[PDB]
Design a protein around this ligand. Sequence first.
Ligand SMILES: [Cl-]
Ligand SMILES: [Cl-]
Ligand SMILES: [Cl-]
Ligand SMILES: [Cl-]
Ligand code: NA
Ligand code: NA
Lengths: 316, 304
Amino acid sequence: TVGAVVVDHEGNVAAAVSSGGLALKHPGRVGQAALYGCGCWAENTGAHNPYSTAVSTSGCGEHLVRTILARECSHALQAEDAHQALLETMQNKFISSPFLASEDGVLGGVIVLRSCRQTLLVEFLWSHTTESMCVGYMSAQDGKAKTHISRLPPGAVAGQSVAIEGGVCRLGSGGFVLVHAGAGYHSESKAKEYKHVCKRACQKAIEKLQAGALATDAVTAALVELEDSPFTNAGMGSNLNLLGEIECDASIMDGKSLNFGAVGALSGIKNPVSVANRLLCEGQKIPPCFLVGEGAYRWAVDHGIPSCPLEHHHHH
Amino acid sequence: TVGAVVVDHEGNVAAAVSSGGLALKHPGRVGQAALYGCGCWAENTGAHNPYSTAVSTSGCGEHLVRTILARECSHALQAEDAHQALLETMQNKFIGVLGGVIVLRSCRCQTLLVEFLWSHTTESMCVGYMSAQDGKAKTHISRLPPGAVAGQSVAIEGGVCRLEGSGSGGFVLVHAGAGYHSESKAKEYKHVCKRACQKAIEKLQAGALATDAVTAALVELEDSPFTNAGMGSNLNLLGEIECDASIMDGKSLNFGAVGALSGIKNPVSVANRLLCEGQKRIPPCFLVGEGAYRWAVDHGIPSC
Ligand SMILES: [Cl-]
Ligand SMILES: [Cl-]
Ligand SMILES: [Cl-]
Ligand SMILES: [Cl-]
Ligand code: NA
Ligand code: NA
């Protein structure tokens, strides 16, 4: 699973998530990366909301769904202390959720940012209960993406302990991006590989922002790079399902409009996040926000999103 | 859309929802009746939840901004005044957007105090309800007041039911749709709600789980050609039926759901079967499309 969160120079936030789901899953199984409130969340400051907040999740899909973690994190981040709010959410609303009390271990990760105001104060954090999680972050002013394999400390137990880190950033046409390329066990073997795709994904988002793009288009450009890595379980290289076929989940949310787009069980499209973003975009102009399976493919093709008919399945 | 909520004689709750979705929708469009937290919710009392609560919602395709409706109603119903809490929630969310909800919350006092409500901003909503003690299902057509504008006002009514003895009883509240008022189809909506409640109670009285009872209710509601669910669902853009359904169990908190399901007579039966198998890698809780069809047939669920 891959994800990204973006804030532009005005405090407009966006979030997206893309995944290939569980290996050998039954055909048509849709997971967290497609589900409203679960895979990602983005919400600009407003009446109640003193902060703009963006969240993207990773790890065990079912664990993330049952606790609606992305939205839960965004609501907790309206509290004054962001570090403490996220840590308590991960401990109490995730690991200790009654919705997961049957589970022997709760496995998940999250990336967040929140901003508030002509200076923009961005706080960004990542937290995970998996052994590790690869992140990358970049601001348009620092102009050099930083990547980091966050690991659980010695003595921690994967699925029972929480790791959490983060930082702060004061920001024209700039902005800030944080991405992740998977939360689970890691191998030092392809650790530089995850770090490299995270760096490139940050650079693409930053370049989009520096060209005047909307937050949603910049977060989508980040996820396109993350998907395209043959090493990530999203887009190309997604785990194969029980029938040895590709079925992708992806979604995106805009903090300003609160509009949402999502695809589930999608095969034959190179970049699932692009269909999610096109659904969100076309929906701003009763438009659909969530398409699955055969109809999602046909809708993507009809809108000129690059396809792979040889990778598309349509069983009877 | 059709939905039902149930509480068994022990205070266990369940909820389910089933819909054909939006007429002429693009193929593969999945709506709220399939989405966790959105179409239905069921949660027994717990360390923060003083009431066992169950919620089923009905929408007219216009899904709401920053809204996970069934779960949000369940959380709001932890306040002391349930009527005010549902009213505030409907107002702060819908008021315009068209939709409706049925809810119940129970608590142990051994006796069970069950409060049940329905609320809509559509012109009308048909509901039915029944306790195992009384033995006669009651059906009713809820209307906006004279002079109200759909999407600019909220109707809300409900009742209170006391169950006791802890035999094999319970309570069920169903709805057959929130939408435009049809004087002509009113009798048919009331009759299917009647049959749905009776099936739900028959299950409870046989000792069944609350999820089996709420499934039996929705099977009846689905089968009516008048409901936009199962048989008679709105046809999509290509002239085909694609169904969404889900179900939640308040005791285990488990969940099952299908979206864009074609070719299966009773979608809620697949959602319930996904939940039941989950009770035993975590099994899938949400299947869509052809994979959902194949899974249903592979599990002996009748196709049409
Ligand atoms: Cl599976
Ligand atoms: Cl990955
Ligand atoms: Cl549509
Ligand atoms: Cl209906
Ligand atoms: Na990939
Ligand atoms: Na029907």
